[PDB]
Symmetry: none
Subunit: 118 residues, 2 copies
């Protein structure tokens, strides 16, 4: 059964999310923000993120770059590239205790394999 | 309350009016952080001043309609939409991207005067 249920539940809202977001120039951190209400569970959110990310790549306005140069990949490859380095947890604690953690929004803003460009 | 800034930006203000509701609709729906309000207006113009003016119109309308409230250190501070605009304008970056990869999105994430709290239209619980 794995994650099939989660995929089914996300596919119920995919078209809605795409028709809202396809309209804007959103960085990946902002796509993450748009699916955060899907679930409180990090792995479920991660699954929703990738479903929306691949679909936006498929439609063609979302392109990705690193170091100012556009990089070409299939939606499937992009998903494999981001999963390979995806944070183990939604937050990483500050090595100085009690200080602000690093979150997945931040990771997508400064430690991602690639960045949205138009 | 720079009347002179208002004079100079009247035209951008008028042009932004025709996408305001759509942008309001979008940001209310997903309860987006201020850094994503900036991303929402990005496509409006390639110009930094024009984008900044769009940002503040959207920001103020959300505050004015009571959808958005702003918090610092885990507590909401009460200001009028105009007061909050001035607080943000006073410290607003000079460039969309810091000269030399720091940008306005990042500033709105980690060094903003305050941070978004979304008030549910139905019965009024808060999303932090």
């Amino acid at each position: 059964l794995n994650n099939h249920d989660v995929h089914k539940r996300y596919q119920d809202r995919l078209e809605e999310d795409v028709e809202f977001t396809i309209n804007y120039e959103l960085p990946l951190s902002c796509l993450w923000s748009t699916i955060k209400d899907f679930s409180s569970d990090f792995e479920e959110k991660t699954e929703a993120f990738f479903i929306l990310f691949k679909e936006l790549l498929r439609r063609g306005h979302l392109k990705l770059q690193r170091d100012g140069q556009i990089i070409g990949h299939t939606p499937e490859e992009w998903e494999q590239i981001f999963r390979e380095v995806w944070p183990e947890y939604e937050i990483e604690p500050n090595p100085l205790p009690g200080y602000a953690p690093f979150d997945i929004g931040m990771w997508l803003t400064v430690e991602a394999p690639a960045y949205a460009v138009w």
